[PDB]
Structures are given as structure tokens and as C-alpha cells.
Amino acid sequence: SMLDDAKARLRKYDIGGKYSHLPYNKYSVLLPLVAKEGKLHLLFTVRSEKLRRAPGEVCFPGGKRDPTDMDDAATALREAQEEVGLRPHQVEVVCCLVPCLIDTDTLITPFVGLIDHNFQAQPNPAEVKDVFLVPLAYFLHPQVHDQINHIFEYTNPEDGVTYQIKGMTANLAVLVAFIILEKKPT
Numbered sequence: 001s002m003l004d005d006a007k008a009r010l011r012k013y014d015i016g017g018k019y020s021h022l023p024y025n026k027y028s029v030l031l032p033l034v035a036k037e038g039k040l041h042l043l044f045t046v047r048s049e050k051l052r053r054a055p056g057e058v059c060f061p062g063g064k065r066d067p068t069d070m071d072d073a074a075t076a077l078r079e080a081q082e083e084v085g086l087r088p089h090q091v092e093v094v095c096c097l098v099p100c101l102i103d104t105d106t107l108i109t110p111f112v113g114l115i116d117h118n119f120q121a122q123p124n125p126a127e128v129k130d131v132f133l134v135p136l137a138y139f140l141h142p143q144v145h146d147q148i149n150h151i152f153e154y155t156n157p158e159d160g161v162t163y164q165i166k167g168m169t170a171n172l173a174v175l176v177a178f179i180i181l182e183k184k185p186t
């Protein structure tokens with residue numbers, strides 16, 4: 001099937017725990033895959049205008065590891081629960097993609113998760129101003145804008161609202177699209 005095909009592709013790129021013990025400042029992100037209307041979508045957040053770091057920006061759910069987390073995947077699941085109400089029975093963590101090195105002392109680890117069809121987002125307004133879906137196929141032919149720095153613009157045809165997606169978030173989206181959608185009969 002569509003969902004079984006996605007997980008089997010993703011598993012070939014799983015690095016597992018290989019880099020997880022290194023002595024960095026540690027953050028995790030969850031890349032949430034949702035099936036709607038016969039196609040795969042990614043779920044994004046818009047960060048609250050009140051936050052210290054990157055207020056108003058598009059990002060995946062995520063945050064800083066804390067002492068309660070059993071491992072890096074637990075960080076990503078805790079944060080997703082707090083930000084959008086995703087419960088653990090509603091997500092299957094399929095793999096761990098290549099981590100992102102920043103600022104010389106920080107390592108951000110991305111996990112891909114398959115989301116239950118009955119999940120409905122409950123944005124926590126102290127952390128998240130908006131939640132939206134983008135079809136995975138968009139990231140193969142994006143609408144690009146140069147700020148020189150590449151910025152994707154996505155307009156939701158439901159309401160005509162435009163979102164800007166950039167940086168690590170945009171890079172990870174393209175990576176997941178390539179993994180899952182390259183070389184497929186139509």
C-alpha cells in the first residue's frame with residue numbers, strides 16, 4: 001500500500017542511534033506524515049509571535065531535550081504533544097534521519113512519524129499560532145522566491161492563505177519528498 005511503501009523507503013535512510021550520545025546541546029524535531037484524500041502531506045506549525053526564538057516562523061514540532069526523556073525520539077513526541085495535542089498512540093516513529101549541526105555546539109535530530117487518520121490538531125496558543133498541511137509532492141516543484149536565500153511560498157487552496165517555508169525546515173521537507181516519491185510508476 002501507500003503507507004507501507006513510505007515506511008519501507010524511509011527505513012533505508014535510518015541512521016538510528018549512531019550520533020545520539022555525542023556531547024552536544026540536543027534538540028529533536030518530528031516530521032509528521034498525514035494521509036489525506038489518497039496522498040501524503042506534512043504537518044507544519046507557525047510559531048507564536050511571543051516566543052524568544054524565531055517568533056512567527058514556520059517549523060516542524062520540536063524542542064530541547066530534558067532530563068525526563070528516555071531518548072531523542074521521546075523529546076520529539078513530548079514536544080509534539082505539548083504544541084499540538086498529538087498523543088503517543090497517534091504516532092508511529094519510523095526512523096531517524098541525518099542530524100543537523102548548528103552553531104558549533106548544537107545537534108538537531110529529525111524523526112519521521114506516521115500520524116493516525118483520526119488525529120485532529122489542537123494548537124496550544126502559547127506556542128503555536130497556526131497548524132497547516134502541505135502535500136508532499138509540492139516539495140518536488142516548489143514556488144521559489146529569493147530574499148541570496150531560497151524561500152518556498154505555499155498557498156492553501158482551501159482559504160488562499162500563503163505561508164513562507166525556509167532554512168532547515170525547507171531542507172528536511174525536500175529530503176523526505178525525495179526519499180518517498182522518487183522513481184515511482186504513476
Ligand SMILES: CCC(CC)C(=O)Nc1ccccc1O
Binds near residue numbers: 028029059064102
Ligand atoms: C526554533 C525552534 C527549534 C527547535 C528544535 C530551535 O530552537 N532551533 C535551534 C536550536 C539551537 C540553536 C539554533 C536553533 O535554531
